[PDB]
């Protein structure tokens, strides 16, 4: 069948969401993935937000895989240009009941200790050793070393519209990033076999992180706000 | 091996373009694919515009296929809502030195008594027998019976931004359609093996058509204007 939900905005204490670590919902309705005190983003922050109920992406009985579409708006404000904002945010799919991973360039979804599979779309703002120039969009499968990336220029503090679509029949994951105020459009796509990397049931959500203390730079930070979010999935099984 | 060009606007008899049939460039810089007299689009019109120089999409020696990206803005104004606007416009790739094909639902790129291969992205406004609900975006390979389609709502007379990207390593052709004034975003993608359908050298361009006389409806028309166009291709050969 078809599952779906839509958050035109976030109401404090959402029954539908699971907030982890620093993730909070502000009084004015936005989902702040990372810590922001008195209007200022801090470093050493990591937070995630998961849809409370698990979604079935595939069925072992029929062998069918779900197709899905998710749309959301986010905003990244980088108050301090030098030396380097960090780290970025991702939309991810992972097994249910996982714990926040390592922060920094791992966005809180990768745990070197005990790794769990995941498919994520990253909006990377800090160039780690494994990264190409930033900012860039990346498609991540079980790792933060993207299978494909594309550069983009951030609209600092502006709103961004993202469209992520997965077509099971072609196994194509296509993502579109648009900054309405600048009129710019970025597109990236890759082939991903969900059935091969993920279990039948998963959690969908966001995760973000600011500068890791090991970098010794308190300015390595920015906001990671989610303004709205809609999700739809169809499993003919 | 990189080839690219950019047209922020179009000038009268540009050396870089090959205009065919009704295609003409207006005094105010727009590329009008189909006939418009005294601000009114007419039926029974067909026109194409090709980049004057051929581009190499693949090399028989190395076996490599080119990756490319093209961006353009177009506008479709439909003055007569009833009974039905027609027919639409396409961005296409075909062998060099082709002639305008049949008009109507064939957009001027398909010639029944001398079919040549082609890959095209259509913005279809008239529902032929082989079509799903209109308007819709479609990916066409050697035929106007799309391999994939997606519906969209036209911003009548408004501007549309299109991004077409082809990644040779994955064979994915992804297209994004955005109507800035409405803030709507449409995305479609499919797998296409250029090397399998097209020759090493091709022409890239646009083609459009208005109502065919056989429909006996003079209102079966609309404008098909191209405002800007940039193209880039890389052959690692
Ligand atoms: C960490 O991030 C902070 C906040 O941006 C940086 O501090 C700021 O450094 C600016 C230097 O580009 C200062 O700008 C000056 O502003 C005044 C008035 O606004 C002008 O007259 C002058 O020409 C400059 O444009 C800005 O005042 C300062 N902000 C504050 C209140 O601290 C900081 O920069 C670096 O460290 C600070 C402590 C100073 O030593 C700066 O000179 C230095 O660039 C960022 N730190 C890092 C690691 O780069
Ligand atoms: C072909 O396209 C023309 C142009 O739109 C159609 O004629 C137009 O028909 C409209 C009927 O829907 C007329 O609209 C009405 O206009 C008056 C005053 O302008 C308003 O008060 C009223 O609220 C409607 O908006 C429109 O005036 C007319 N345009 C002109 C100047 O001719 C045409 O429709 C066909 O002919 C007209 C004259 C009527 O007989 C219609 O019933 C008839 O369908 C379109 N023809 C086809 C094949 O549909
Ligand atoms: C649709 O437009 C065509 C123009 O490309 C018309 O054909 C052209 O008509 C010219 C004068 O009518 C003639 O000099 C051209 O040789 C001819 N070109 C072609 C494609 O052969 C076409 O038909 C014309 O108009 C209709 C009404 C009849 O009068 C025909 O005898 C004309 O050729 C136009 N179709 C219709 C039905 O309007
Ligand atoms: C980065 O953020 C951490 C929060 O997770 C800070 O440590 C806190 O959490 C750890 C384990 O989760 C606890 O053991 C600490 O008691 C917590 N500290 C606080 C603020 O109450 C962490 O702070 C640093 O490390 C901890 C272990 C203490 O030594 C703090 O004094 C120290 O500042 C913070 N890192 C930095 C450098 O800001
Ligand atoms: O400053 C923020 C960043 O901190 C870390 O980056 C590394 C750091 O671990 C250390 O190896 O030193 C180098 C510079 O020599 C970098 O700062 C995180 O790994 C980054 O993701 C980022 O948070
Ligand atoms: O009226 C515009 C359309 O005219 C033609 O469509 C067909 C027509 O040829 C004839 O077969 O009758 C049917 C309806 O019974 C349609 O009108 C073109 O083929 C279309 O592309 C369009 O121009
Ligand atoms: Ca990074
Ligand atoms: Ca059609
Ligand atoms: Mn990255
Ligand atoms: Mn069609």
Swiss-Prot record, chains A, B:
Pfam families: Lectin_legB. Glycans are attached at residues 44, 219. InterPro entries: ConA-like_dom_sf (IPR013320), L-lectin (IPR016363), Lectin_legB_Mn/Ca_BS (IPR019825), Legume_lectin_dom (IPR001220), Leguminous_Lectin (IPR050258). Keywords: Glycoprotein, Lectin. One of its GO terms (molecular function) is carbohydrate binding. It comes from the Eukaryota. SUPFAM superfamilies: Concanavalin A-like lectins/glucanases. Coiled coil: none annotated. PANTHER family: CONCANAVALIN A-LIKE LECTIN FAMILY PROTEIN (PTHR32401), LECTIN (PTHR32401:SF45). Belongs to the leguminous lectin family. Lectin. This is Basic agglutinin. The lineage of its organism: Eukaryota, Viridiplantae, Streptophyta, Embryophyta, Tracheophyta. The gene is WBAI.
């Amino acid at each position: 069948k078809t599952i779906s939900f839509n958050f035109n905005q976030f109401h404090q204490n959402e029954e539908q969401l699971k907030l982890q670590r620093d993730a909070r919902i502000s009084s004015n309705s936005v989902l702040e993935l990372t810590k922001v005190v008195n209007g200022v983003p801090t470093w050493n922050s990591t937070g995630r937000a998961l849809y409370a109920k698990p979604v079935q992406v595939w069925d072992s009985t029929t062998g069918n895989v779900a197709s899905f579409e998710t749309r959301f708006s986010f905003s990244i404000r980088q108050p301090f240009p030098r030396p380097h904002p960090a780290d970025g945010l991702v939309f991810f799919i992972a097994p249910p009941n996982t714990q926040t991973g390592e922060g920094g360039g791992y966005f809180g979804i990768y745990n070197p200790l005990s790794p769990y599979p995941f498919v994520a779309v990253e909006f990377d703002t800090f160039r780690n050793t494994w990264d190409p120039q930033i900012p860039h969009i990346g498609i991540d499968v079980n790792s933060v070393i993207s299978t494909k990336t594309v550069p983009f220029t951030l609209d600092n503090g502006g709103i961004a519209n993202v469209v992520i679509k997965y077509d099971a029949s072609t196994k194509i994951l296509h993502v579109v990033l648009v900054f309405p105020s600048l009129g710019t459009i970025y597109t990236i796509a890759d082939i991903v076999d969900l059935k091969q990397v993920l279990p039948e049931s998963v959690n969908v959500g966001f995760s973000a992180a600011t500068g890791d203390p090991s970098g010794k730079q308190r300015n390595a930070t920015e906001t990671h706000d989610i303004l709205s979010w809609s999700f739809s999935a169809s499993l003919p099984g």
